[PDB]
Amino acid sequence: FLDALAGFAVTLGSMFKKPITEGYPEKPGPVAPRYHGRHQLNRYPDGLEKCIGCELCAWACPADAIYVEGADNTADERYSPGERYGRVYQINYLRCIGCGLCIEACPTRALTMTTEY
Amino acid sequence: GLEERLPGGILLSTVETVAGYVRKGSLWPATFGLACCAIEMMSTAGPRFDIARFGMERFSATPRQADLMIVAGRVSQKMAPVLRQIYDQMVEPKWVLAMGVCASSGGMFNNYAVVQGVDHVVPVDIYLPGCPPRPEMLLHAILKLHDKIQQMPLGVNREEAIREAEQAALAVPPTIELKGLLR
Amino acid sequence: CTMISLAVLYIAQDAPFLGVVQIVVYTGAVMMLFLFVLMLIGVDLTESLVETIKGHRIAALIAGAGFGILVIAGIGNVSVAGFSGLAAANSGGNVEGLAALIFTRYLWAFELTSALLITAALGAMVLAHRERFERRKTQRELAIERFQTGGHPTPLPNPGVYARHNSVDVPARLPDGSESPLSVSTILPHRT
Amino acid sequence: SAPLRILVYSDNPRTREQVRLALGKRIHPELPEIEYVDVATAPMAISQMDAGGFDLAILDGEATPAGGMGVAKQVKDEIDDCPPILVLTGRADDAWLAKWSRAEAAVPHPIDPIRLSDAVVSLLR
Amino acid sequence: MTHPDPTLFGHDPWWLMLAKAVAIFVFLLLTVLSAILIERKLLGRMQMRFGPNRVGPAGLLQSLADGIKLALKEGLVPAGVDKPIYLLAPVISVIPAFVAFSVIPLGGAVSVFGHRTPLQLTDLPVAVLFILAATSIGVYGIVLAGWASGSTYPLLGGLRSSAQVVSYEIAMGLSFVAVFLYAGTMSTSGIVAAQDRTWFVFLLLPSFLVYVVSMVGETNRAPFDLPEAEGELVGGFHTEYSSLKFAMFMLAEYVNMTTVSALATTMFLGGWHAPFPFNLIDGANSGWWPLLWFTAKVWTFMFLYFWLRATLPRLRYDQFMALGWKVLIPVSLLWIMVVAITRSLRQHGEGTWAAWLLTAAVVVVVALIWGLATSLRRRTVQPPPPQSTGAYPVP
Amino acid sequence: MALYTPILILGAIAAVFAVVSVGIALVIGPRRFNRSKLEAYECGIDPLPPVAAGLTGQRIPIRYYLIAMLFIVFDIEIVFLYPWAVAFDSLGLFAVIEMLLFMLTVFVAYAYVWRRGGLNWD
Amino acid sequence: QAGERIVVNMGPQHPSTHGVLRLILEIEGEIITEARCGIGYLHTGIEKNLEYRNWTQGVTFVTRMDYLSPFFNETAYCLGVEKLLGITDDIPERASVIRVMLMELNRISSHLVALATGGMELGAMSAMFYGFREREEILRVFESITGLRMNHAYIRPGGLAADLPDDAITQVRRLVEILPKRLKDLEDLLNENYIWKARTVGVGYLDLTGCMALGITGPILRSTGLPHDLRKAQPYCGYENYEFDVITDDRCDSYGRYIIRVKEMHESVKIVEQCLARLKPGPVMISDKKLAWPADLKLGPDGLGNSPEHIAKIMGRSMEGLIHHFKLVTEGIRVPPGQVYVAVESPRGELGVHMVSDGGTRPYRVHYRDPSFTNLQAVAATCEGGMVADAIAAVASIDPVMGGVDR
Numbered sequence A: 001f002l003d004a005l006a007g008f009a010v011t012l013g014s015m016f017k018k019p020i021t022e023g024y025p026e027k028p029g030p031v032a033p034r035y036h037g038r039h040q041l042n043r044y045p046d047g048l049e050k051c052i053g054c055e056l057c058a059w060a061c062p063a064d065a066i067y068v069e070g071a072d073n074t075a076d077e078r079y080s081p082g083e084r085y086g087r088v089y090q091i092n093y094l095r096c097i098g099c100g101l102c103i104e105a106c107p108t109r110a111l112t113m114t115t116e117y
Numbered sequence B: 001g002l003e004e005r006l007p008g009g010i011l012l013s014t015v016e017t018v019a020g021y022v023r024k025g026s027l028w029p030a031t032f033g034l035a036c037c038a039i040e041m042m043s044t045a046g047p048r049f050d051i052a053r054f055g056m057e058r059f060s061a062t063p064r065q066a067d068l069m070i071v072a073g074r075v076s077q078k079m080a081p082v083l084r085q086i087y088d089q090m091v092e093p094k095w096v097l098a099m100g101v102c103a104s105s106g107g108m109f110n111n112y113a114v115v116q117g118v119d120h121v122v123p124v125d126i127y128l129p130g131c132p133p134r135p136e137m138l139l140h141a142i143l144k145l146h147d148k149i150q151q152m153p154l155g156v157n158r159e160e161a162i163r164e165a166e167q168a169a170l171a172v173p174p175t176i177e178l179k180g181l182l183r
Numbered sequence C: 001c002t003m004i005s006l007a008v009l010y011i012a013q014d015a016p017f018l019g020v021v022q023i024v025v026y027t028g029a030v031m032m033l034f035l036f037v038l039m040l041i042g043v044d045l046t047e048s049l050v051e052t053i054k055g056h057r058i059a060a061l062i063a064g065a066g067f068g069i070l071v072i073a074g075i076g077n078v079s080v081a082g083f084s085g086l087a088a089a090n091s092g093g094n095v096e097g098l099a100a101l102i103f104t105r106y107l108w109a110f111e112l113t114s115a116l117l118i119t120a121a122l123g124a125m126v127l128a129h130r131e132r133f134e135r136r137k138t139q140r141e142l143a144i145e146r147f148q149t150g151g152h153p154t155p156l157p158n159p160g161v162y163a164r165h166n167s168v169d170v171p172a173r174l175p176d177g178s179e180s181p182l183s184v185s186t187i188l189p190h191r192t
Numbered sequence D: 001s002a003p004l005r006i007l008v009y010s011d012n013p014r015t016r017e018q019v020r021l022a023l024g025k026r027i028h029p030e031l032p033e034i035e036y037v038d039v040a041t042a043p044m045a046i047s048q049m050d051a052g053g054f055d056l057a058i059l060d061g062e063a064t065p066a067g068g069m070g071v072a073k074q075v076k077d078e079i080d081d082c083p084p085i086l087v088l089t090g091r092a093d094d095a096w097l098a099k100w101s102r103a104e105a106a107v108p109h110p111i112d113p114i115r116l117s118d119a120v121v122s123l124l125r
Numbered sequence E: 001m002t003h004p005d006p007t008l009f010g011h012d013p014w015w016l017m018l019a020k021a022v023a024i025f026v027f028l029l030l031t032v033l034s035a036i037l038i039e040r041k042l043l044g045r046m047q048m049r050f051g052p053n054r055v056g057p058a059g060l061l062q063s064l065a066d067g068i069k070l071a072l073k074e075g076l077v078p079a080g081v082d083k084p085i086y087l088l089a090p091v092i093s094v095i096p097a098f099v100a101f102s103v104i105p106l107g108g109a110v111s112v113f114g115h116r117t118p119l120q121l122t123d124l125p126v127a128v129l130f131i132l133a134a135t136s137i138g139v140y141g142i143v144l145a146g147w148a149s150g151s152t153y154p155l156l157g158g159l160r161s162s163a164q165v166v167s168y169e170i171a172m173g174l175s176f177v178a179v180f181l182y183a184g185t186m187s188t189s190g191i192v193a194a195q196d197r198t199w200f201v202f203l204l205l206p207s208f209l210v211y212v213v214s215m216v217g218e219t220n221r222a223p224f225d226l227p228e229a230e231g232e233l234v235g236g237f238h239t240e241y242s243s244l245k246f247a248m249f250m251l252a253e254y255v256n257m258t259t260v261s262a263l264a265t266t267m268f269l270g271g272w273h274a275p276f277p278f279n280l281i282d283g284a285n286s287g288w289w290p291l292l293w294f295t296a297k298v299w300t301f302m303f304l305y306f307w308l309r310a311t312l313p314r315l316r317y318d319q320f321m322a323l324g325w326k327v328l329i330p331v332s333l334l335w336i337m338v339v340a341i342t343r344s345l346r347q348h349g350e351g352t353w354a355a356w357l358l359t360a361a362v363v364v365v366v367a368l369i370w371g372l373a374t375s376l377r378r379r380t381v382q383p384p385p386p387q388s389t390g391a392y393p394v395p
Numbered sequence F: 001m002a003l004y005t006p007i008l009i010l011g012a013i014a015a016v017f018a019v020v021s022v023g024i025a026l027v028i029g030p031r032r033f034n035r036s037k038l039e040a041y042e043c044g045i046d047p048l049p050p051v052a053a054g055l056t057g058q059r060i061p062i063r064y065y066l067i068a069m070l071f072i073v074f075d076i077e078i079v080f081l082y083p084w085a086v087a088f089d090s091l092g093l094f095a096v097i098e099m100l101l102f103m104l105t106v107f108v109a110y111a112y113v114w115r116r117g118g119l120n121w122d
Numbered sequence G: 001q002a003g004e005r006i007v008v009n010m011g012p013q014h015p016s017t018h019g020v021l022r023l024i025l026e027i028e029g030e031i032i033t034e035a036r037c038g039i040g041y042l043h044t045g046i047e048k049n050l051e052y053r054n055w056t057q058g059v060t061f062v063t064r065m066d067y068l069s070p071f072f073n074e075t076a077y078c079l080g081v082e083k084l085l086g087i088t089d090d091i092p093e094r095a096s097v098i099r100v101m102l103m104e105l106n107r108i109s110s111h112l113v114a115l116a117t118g119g120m121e122l123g124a125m126s127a128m129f130y131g132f133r134e135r136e137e138i139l140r141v142f143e144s145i146t147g148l149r150m151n152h153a154y155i156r157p158g159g160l161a162a163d164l165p166d167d168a169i170t171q172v173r174r175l176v177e178i179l180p181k182r183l184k185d186l187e188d189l190l191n192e193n194y195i196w197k198a199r200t201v202g203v204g205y206l207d208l209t210g211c212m213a214l215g216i217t218g219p220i221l222r223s224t225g226l227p228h229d230l231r232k233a234q235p236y237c238g239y240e241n242y243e244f245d246v247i248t249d250d251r252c253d254s255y256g257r258y259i260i261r262v263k264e265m266h267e268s269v270k271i272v273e274q275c276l277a278r279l280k281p282g283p284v285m286i287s288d289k290k291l292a293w294p295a296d297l298k299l300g301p302d303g304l305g306n307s308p309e310h311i312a313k314i315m316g317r318s319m320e321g322l323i324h325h326f327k328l329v330t331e332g333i334r335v336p337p338g339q340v341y342v343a344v345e346s347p348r349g350e351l352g353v354h355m356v357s358d359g360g361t362r363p364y365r366v367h368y369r370d371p372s373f374t375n376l377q378a379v380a381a382t383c384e385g386g387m388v389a390d391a392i393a394a395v396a397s398i399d400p401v402m403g404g405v406d407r
């Protein structure tokens, strides 16, 4: 029964097919559009920071991978609309698990997850 | 090693560069996957990617032939002695890649059972975020480690580099003291 | 090493086939002897070699020395009486000459070597081949006993894992603080 | 008469300062003078202990690139007649690993000056 | 006529024979490096990968890079090993591997620097059996590497290597018999000359198949791979070995692969004779082209090795020994008798009886081997009875 | 000595290469004494106390010892075929019949071993 | 006797022991006379750490045990949370369909990993690569749907983290079309291979009685001919609405389990085709705003983040919407006090979840009866008496995932 040798056909045939490997790093493969890459703090079109420093992103993080501290948007120095902005914002990427709960939490879309990894 | 007894100059520089080029290639990982990150190493070896393209296909089953210990997983308390034993039973030169957040810092599992970072038991050369890190991130970290290896000194240069790195590290303030802009 | 050296000497003495066959067969045979050394004597057992029979060591050494000396004296000088070159016989092929002799002049001994082989096989089967009454239970057979291991301490408890001690010799700790007998295989000496 | 030489290993300069503060030039007037060798990198600590001439090594278990417990295990497996090792542990649950490191003593963070001094005295005595 | 040909062998001046020895050694070195790289790459292709692609141009330096890295890596001598034998086992493995290749015919007579010499280091009246002897000596390297390591896994690897030998060595020995019958000589050059009419692969197909299986076993290669058995014994025998000692174990493995491939080419694939598409070309079997043909056939065997590794799982060494003793040895022993009877009959003019006996014997052998593979290894089993624990109602 | 001095030269080259390779392994590359590094590999677990080594694994049974014994006799017997094979043409019919009888005797021994379970354990 | 027996750690660091499983084997020669399992080298305290995170954060924890069956862990967790909430009937039909589709694709992926690692442990080097090629197709689909290749937190109490992207349905159709063809390659390497059968057939035998006594489940149990599957008995997530056959075999050995997994992949492909047919547009989260996850993820040039429509609703128009977003995101729902046991058919057997709520916003106690943990009790039965090589095959057949074992 040649069936018992079917495997030899599989490997041999795959020899003559073009390898399916993605060419990272020179030609990196396409990540999904929805991929949970690096967090990113976004700005409004006028340049103001979106992050109002509500700490909801940090609140929802299961790994405590976000540390945020808010500060007043004093008229002399305003960074975001409203009366609070995120003065200190740190993500400990050695604690981040890419779960994406932070961006789901953010009420201003200040925090997004880019496809960069 | 006689390569260390070689005096400085063009000879030692050429030995260093040749050794770095040789060791960045054929950087055989140890067959030491843990937790879910191990599945991502296997995927990195899988056809879609190809760890083999970097000469790293041979996952040395024995620590003796392994050059790189990709911890690649969460190290439980009971496992730390085993991981250290494996690291010791590898032979110089040795490098450790803390793949994943768990291996690097304990990740999401900040509790009794996890060691809170591989570096608690073995020197870590590269930290790799992700939970798990997608195979491209693993390859990126591996290439960063390749760059680190290429510049690795030898002999008298090794001693001088150790002394200089000591002098530099003695001065860096701890992360807890980087209070920039904190209220 | 001795067998291979003797094979090389045979080759030097215009016996190529004999030397090569020596290497092959004695490589195999010495490997089997090594296996039996592991099986019956030990992997790294260091024998004492102390004379257990009183005065036997000195007597054996004396007897061996005397026998060797007498044999060498009896041999004396022999090649002085003429040493014909074997090239005449090896002409036309050493293996061909050996074949001509074996299957014409010594075909009887050649056939009797088959009887030697049969006797060796029969002896091995009679003395060493354990029969049905001592056949080890198959995993299938061992997996059904009442409920094989299973109900019986399922997998037996693992050896204890302590800081500074995780070898298989270490015994696990029962809730009362005592060492669990089942945790460590009985063959091991209780320690560690 | 010899100044006891103590190796203090920690990536954090403040942990080294605290260790060098709880201990002083003399742990007690009955003890010899103490000299401190600060090391911030595990390779440097290993090289220093290879040179020997140390009476005690204080290794920070929380060291970033190479934790103190790993260094303790390494030195006890690599240096013959190595000095007693005292390990600083970042949490109570690290105690188990502190035992695995075979460090002669373990002192939890934050470093209690008196506890550290007492442990050092016990190790030197 | 008489092989080795006295007018061609033994006349090399010291410098020429030294040069040929050095050239053969360098050829084996380059072939080992090429095998290391080309395997990796072909396995990648069979798995739709690229294999080494970045270390040097097109990854050509990957194998040499790995070798130099093993050179640059710490040379371990673990405590508890039998230091003398532990250090010697790599040498015992390597030296015979290279020595065996001495009698491999890479080509016919060629004129170099005014001397007509065979394109091979030497030839012996017992060359093939000499190759067998050298390979047999080589296995002691594996066995003693496993034993001297003073660890469980190397010891199991060494024992598996001994079982390997028990399984395959008699098979190779018997496989040589039909080739000797048809060539009338054990010298490799004489065998190649005898294969001038037609390659023995067609005439001695059963012997060729048995020898192929048995050499794949001999080289500790997949699907046998038993002494190493990464998935079962971590590193097998070469556990506790690092740096160039492990490198030399692998080098010995690959040199043995090359040796057995070249020996298969010699006995069964007409040695260095040009294949049919090129055989019609004038001078194809002359000059240095025979070197090209011999290399091509050796590398087809290497391709077979890599293909087997990519496709087949690894057997249990007891299963391999069952294959060797219940199939290979019986098949080769019966084939020797069949070949002898057939040749004797045709020599005495009973050609029709010879052909009928050959066909009937091969048919019976293929039927009985199929029975063994399917009837003795029955695809049926009995049921099971209940026990203390309550059991659900089966469908 | 001809036809062999090439083998001797190649063996000398191989032996020099192998011993130099072992020396290179030992003297090239870093060396760092480490008790954990030197002790046996046991998949990461601490090796069983060598002090108590002489209680287990002293002797390693082989389940194919019978096949191991038969291997010696069969290997030493089959070598009779090589001189027979090479001289086959020169010998003639009587030698063919002699070898057929010898191989039939070997077959009887082999069949006795096989059919009585001599080849079953391993 | 003792002199003829070695005791060897198959050990955590071993290719076939998934790095963190310690098989301590007493071997006479090379026959496994006795077997023990050191477990917990991969313990993580996930069960305790759950207790300090709200619901919908414990999803990210549970998905990281039995990491080869992430969606099964998440589905078990969410089924339990909903059962305590008493909203199991309120889950949108689309959410249930997507849960079934994802669990079946996940079964295919997990079986692919099992076959790959088993073949590699048994020397089938190309088996791993082909299995991981198919798995990479499946993981492309998972990444597109959830944005993560692994440890997805996509299934949430009350539905899903987000709806499928527009292209997800077409990708899943492409899977249903190509995946059996690709699986044909892996099956050819192994199914009828003589060496594979010789290596697995008759190895690791475990009768139905043994499976019951040790509480074995999944492919091991169904290799005994018992067609027990939690998808048919005690249906969940609407599995009752799908026409699929419970794969079972009567060999009781490693090859039977391998064939069961191979056939389960085809059955899962059929179930995914059925899901695609049944899939209809609609909500993927419960309508109850008091419990529904308030986030609405959407893509833009900036990246993935809360959709601008939701941002406008909560920051500009709805005070109640803002309060609900804030509370459900921060401390999360509070589950009525109760104690529930919910089981699913993970690829390795009955993945059970005992979950206890004390009325608070955090799970009082979450315990996973991971099938691997119980299955590993069969190693002593399936390895003792066979060779170490047979032990490798038996353990691979058990297909343990130490993440689910230790947790």
Ligand SMILES: CC(C)=CCC/C(C)=C\CC/C(C)=C/CC/C(C)=C\CC/C(C)=C/CC/C(C)=C/CC/C(C)=C/CC/C(C)=C/CC/C(C)=C\CC1=C(C)C(=O)c2ccccc2C1=O
Pocket: B030, B031, B032, B033, B034, B035, B038, B039, B041, B042, B045, B057, B058, B059, E029, E032, E033, E036, E040, E043, E063, E064, E066, E067, E068, E070, E071, E244, E246, E247, E248, E250, E251, F021, G014, G015, G016, G017, G018, G019, G020, G117, G125, G128, G400, G401, G402
């Ligand atoms: C000596 C000298 C100087 C001479 C002079 C001349 C000279 C310089 C050179 C001469 C020639 C020489 C000596 C050359 C040197 C090179 C040489 C000798 C050879 C070495 C190179 C070589 C042998 C190459 C080929 C070998 C080869 C084909 C290797 C590929 C092997 C493969 C395919 C490996 C991949 C395996 C793989 C996917 C590994 C991942 C497994 C890991 C790490 C995870 C662990 C893990 C596993 C395994 C689970 O099962 C699992 C299951 C479920 C959940 C979790 C897990 C889990 O955690």
Ligand code: SF4
Pocket: A050, A051, A052, A053, A054, A055, A056, A057, A058, A068, A086, A105, A106, A107, A108, A109, A110, A111
């Ligand atoms: S949740 Fe959004 S707005 Fe609030 S602090 Fe985090 S990033 Fe800034």
Ligand code: SF4
Pocket: A039, A057, A060, A061, A062, A063, A064, A065, A066, A091, A095, A096, A097, A098, A099, A100, A101, A102, A103
């Ligand atoms: S991805 Fe998840 S774990 Fe990482 S920072 Fe965002 S919310 Fe926290």
Ligand code: SF4
Pocket: A097, B034, B035, B036, B037, B072, B073, B074, B099, B100, B101, B102, B103, B107, B130, B131, B132, B133, G064, G067, G151
């Ligand atoms: S980093 Fe994430 S994927 Fe990797 S081992 Fe830890 S939890 Fe698992």
